[PDB]
Design a protein around this ligand. Structure first.
Ligand SMILES: [Cl-]
Ligand SMILES: [Cl-]
Ligand SMILES: [Cl-]
Ligand SMILES: [Cl-]
Ligand SMILES: [Cl-]
Ligand SMILES: [Cl-]
Ligand SMILES: [Mn+2]
Ligand SMILES: [Mn+2]
Ligand SMILES: [Mn+2]
Ligand SMILES: [Mn+2]
Ligand SMILES: [Mn+2]
Ligand SMILES: [Mn+2]
Ligand SMILES: [Zn+2]
Ligand SMILES: [Zn+2]
Ligand SMILES: [Zn+2]
Ligand SMILES: [Zn+2]
Ligand SMILES: [Zn+2]
Ligand SMILES: [Zn+2]
Lengths: 256, 257, 257, 258, 259, 257
């Protein structure tokens, strides 16, 4: 198995003892994803990508974080929705920090954090920084971390056109949209019900945020753009593009 | 469709809670060494498995489990010096339980059952519960009720303890990665258990105190505290039904319709 | 008749807030390197200047700004390895924003506009707001409204973008110490600028991921991410009026009497 | 070009630290009520002004000041019940001081002077310094030196006290918004002072203890603890030279050039 | 020169003992908690301190000022934190206290600490304080600081002694709050703070295999005790005291041998 | 007994039940006090005064805080002396806050915090503020706290004249001096060995603080003044003044009803 959770400590110890062990940590969230998808999408997707990348480069995947930072309106609908279960920033940062500290104790020195929830970013970054600060106090400076969001690897203009033949608008309105739905169709068809999609126009917000969040500024279904044009085929395209891009990036950052 | 909150859309979840009788379950585990014969997510798999079967019988829902738990103690987990074991600081675990309870309250939920499969998590789960309730109280909510239990506590009946432990019983004290857990795994996840690797050693014994930093020489090299050589899928099935039934009834009594 | 709270008497401030409908504005910047050609308090100066002008037009008051912001990230500020750059830990920035909101609420204020001038601050400002609003609810206050915004998010009109970037626009991705900020500075604080020191280097290109510890070699030696050789006072005047008007109308719509 | 780090480019700042004996100064103030006659940023303006002058005179640099400080105490600042006064929790002020020292240490700086302008700040500035120095030790750094001082502690000359308080000096325990601060403000920021609005009331008196919640009746209505009627620009310039001079020498003593 | 209590020593006396190189320090960790109608509320501080004092005299150790406030009371372990008098700290507060103290003893040059807990619920937070402190010490280059944490009652294991304490059969520390065990030790150590006449004789408390929150006052005896101390005696107390003192004294010699 | 720890919860409940019960809490420290005194002086003195004041006005005394904030050179010698065991500020604040929260839960509403360690003050104050903030969130606003350092009641020139016949240099250098040593001779003479006093010249400091602490600026013995002229008689004088003033103040702030 490529999952650390499915290994005995002896199998894990042996892999780390090899000296060139690369670990991957998916970081997601429990969040509403419209009427058509389940709420663990942000955990499922990064974990899936990690698995496939891990199989191709010989890496191991740590148990993913199921709860992430609070959902923001302009990018995820808003934390006012039912089901969405968010952690405070300090809690997420502390979790990332504790994990990096423990991996360092194991002898691991190469970590890839794969974010599946846009809003986690800064808290993952702070957690990495606080952990490296600590490792430095303990005499460790060779621990390296690569943090990335798999969607950032779908930049090829060609690829974007096959995914958005009617023109692209940006990652800003993608919550529960074509991109994530297509991936879910390919990896978890049982958890996607395209027939429930609400084909509302893309969501537009002014250049600023309001708190407490105003429900009426987010489309009723919770999506920021219609996933009507999503397909298992598009999902397969995105997946391979992400897996190959991420696998090559890892080889480049963590060379033997 | 599913009993798992993560496998539902927010609308389905919303509907289940709006019914006003919704009971939610949260498994709290750990990524910890379990000897040479079992994978390291045992403490997550078991409570989650027990939650699913209880949820199916009483109509409850199961929240995504907490994969990381408190540090492993030598006298009940072998120690935190083992590789693979990835523990959280107490504050981090406490804060996670606290944030989740707060969010569930925001959804309108008021009935929560925390089920941990990692002995050392207990006190931090309790503090997180206490801190969340205090906070809910400041918010004007005093009807949020929480039940916290470790599934193995429901295996009390002597008749069941003879079946599992013929040659005698040395309490849950020494039991990490032993008969009990290994049996359940054999029944629930036979592919994640290789009993052929079990290192059969005599029951670990410690003095009536703890030492820090942990001295590696005071815990069997395998990481186990007792041999799981007599574990069996049959013992597993027994343990499983006993727990599912007991916990299911306990919940019905604490959260009557 | 200043718009700055710090320049007022507590009785003058009190009358303003007790008058009702009082809008407070808090600039949130940072002490960060901005190349060879600009001073390091740019992120405090710019948003403060915008606040002053907006407050003068709509009748709002401006709180003293937060001088220190969150750590600088390579893909938008060059990195926190540069000298001079003095960054706070996330929890520190978040707690500062939280404390201030709590106090304004005690004053009786209920309308706050947070104007960010440092890209990396956003999420910590957001958490501060959320933690504060949560707290106000415990106190029985649910009518406190906050609007957070970065003054640059108001420069989107194609026509305006055309005049600022004739030879093309590569986004705000690498707009640190570039044409945008440098232009604004030339128009508001020309003495703290010196285009002759600008290093006319090509745009910065980074892979679709981040690496820690930060690799100093992946950031232009000067600290800038894009050349500001084409900055000017004229462009500064354009951006300024655009932002002031856009933000002023925005505030009127979010905070009507 | 300036003594304010905020007004320098990172290159110039780096060149100054490279010298090896650069001194940095950090003003720590507060946004707090100061009666009917003065603005509320007095505690930032004054220590900032003194830092500027001291820094220019001795060749040091001034960091951006902390605009928000610890909660106002009744017996020393009227109380945190007044509107306008915007205070931070102790942990927040402490953490801010701690983070700054950590960063300055990263630049290579090793000499810092913290000039407090708000009486109640001190202990939290101290914990911040302690926690920072503890971290530096873990990181292998033990040559970072910090001097913390409240500028008013340099006005102790009996002859100076006389010129400032003919009728007598009843201590700094009721000098909130009184003759001392108002005088300095008249010498530095006269536009932010209006003696016409001063409420000439007798010196507030307090028992040897504090009560919480703070009882509004135990503090003069206007917010001041003593009258600033006798304040003057001359006294202010007197205080200014005494402080700048005194602090300037203490710094040269504690941070001798190399 | 003066006593086994660090608080009664001058810093020079303390310094002289630590300079020895193998000085053992003991820290009592108790609580201010209700103990039924028959005993005072500082029992959890008194008992461990009393055990520490005696152990210190026999092995040559010093005793630090005890922590008076401990972690919140649990219904199934101490009646519950809803009774008046009981004054508990949050987990983070007790952990931080233990952490700060260890950090300081290390600065003194001490390297051997025994934490004697007298309140069942303190255990895990003491443990986290130890772990966090040892982590800090490590960043500071210190890896030779050793900590032994124990609850004195765990040294009362011999079946023989157990029969003499419970001639009618044991019941486990699951309901030994204010029961026979603590009351006997008090009758032997502080008779003036105990009055058996007020002891409410009721059947042992029993609880399901789980806890509920908010706590339900009804699931715990009214007096606060989980079992009766009616059969408590100054004699049983003298027996328990000696067993613990000797057991712990020998355990400490084992863990901290003289250099 | 006036000690809460020596009461039964029933007896304590009965006292708070009166509705006007005043609780007193000593806050001290474990700190070096020269060659002539033990290190728990800062706990013994305020606890002793508390005891007397409580017996006199009918109040109860809570267990004292044995550990306090870090010793400062200019008022405690420095935190570099062995024996001195100090808490971080956050830990002391949190301890005060938790106790006040618990007392509020008991129904109690009157608390006097008696400090006996100079450095604790502001952290005791933050703890009080934070706890009252919480009580407010919980709908409780009738909880009143009086905080004081017992030595602040010894102001009368006549009384000082008698204690320092040959002049007085303020509390600025009283650590382990005449004042505390005199009280100890009158209250705990067995804990004082006046024969060990190191009669050195008073300590002098500039108008500022230096960090890290330089041991060279503190008399080797750890005292800031010589206690050679301390006496049981002066101890009884000081004790009279304190108990008197404090008792009167509390009856003033917490009148019976
Ligand atoms: Cl998303
Ligand atoms: Cl286990
Ligand atoms: Cl920027
Ligand atoms: Cl002041
Ligand atoms: Cl107990
Ligand atoms: Cl003192
Ligand atoms: Mn998301
Ligand atoms: Mn476990
Ligand atoms: Mn910036
Ligand atoms: Mn002030
Ligand atoms: Mn107890
Ligand atoms: Mn002291
Ligand atoms: Zn998503
Ligand atoms: Zn397990
Ligand atoms: Zn900038
Ligand atoms: Zn002032
Ligand atoms: Zn007890
Ligand atoms: Zn003292």
């Amino acid at each position: 198995s490529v999952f650390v959770g499915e290994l005995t400590w002896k199998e894990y110890e042996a892999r780390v003892a090899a000296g060139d062990c690369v670990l991957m940590l998916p970081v997601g969230a429990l969040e509403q994803h419209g009427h058509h998808m389940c709420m663990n999408v942000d955990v499922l997707l990064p974990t899936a990508v990690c698995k496939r990348v891990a199989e191709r480069i010989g890496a191991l995947v740590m148990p993913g974080l199921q709860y992430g930072y609070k959902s923001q309106q302009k990018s995820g609908g808003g934390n006012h929705f039912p089901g969405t279960t968010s952690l405070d920033g300090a809690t997420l940062t502390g979790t990332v920090q504790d994990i990096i500290r423990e991996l360092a104790r194991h002898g691991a020195r190469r970590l890839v954090l794969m974010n599946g929830h846009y809003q986690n970013s800064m808290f993952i970054v702070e957690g990495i920084d606080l952990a490296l600060r600590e490792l430095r106090y303990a005499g460790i400076q060779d621990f390296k971390v690569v943090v990335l969001s798999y969607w950032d690897f779908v930049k090829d203009p060609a690829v974007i056109q096959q995914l958005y033949p009617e023109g692209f608008l940006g990652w800003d309105i993608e919550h529960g949209g074509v991109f994530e739905t297509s991936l879910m169709l390919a990896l978890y068809p049982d958890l996607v019900d395209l027939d429930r999609v609400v084909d509302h126009p893309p969501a537009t917000f002014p250049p600023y945020d309001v708190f407490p969040v105003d429900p009426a500024r987010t489309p009723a279904p919770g999506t920021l753009s219609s996933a009507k044009t999503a397909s298992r085929e598009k999902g397969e395209l995105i997946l391979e593009v992400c897996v190959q891009g991420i696998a090559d990036a890892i080889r480049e950052e963590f060379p033997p």
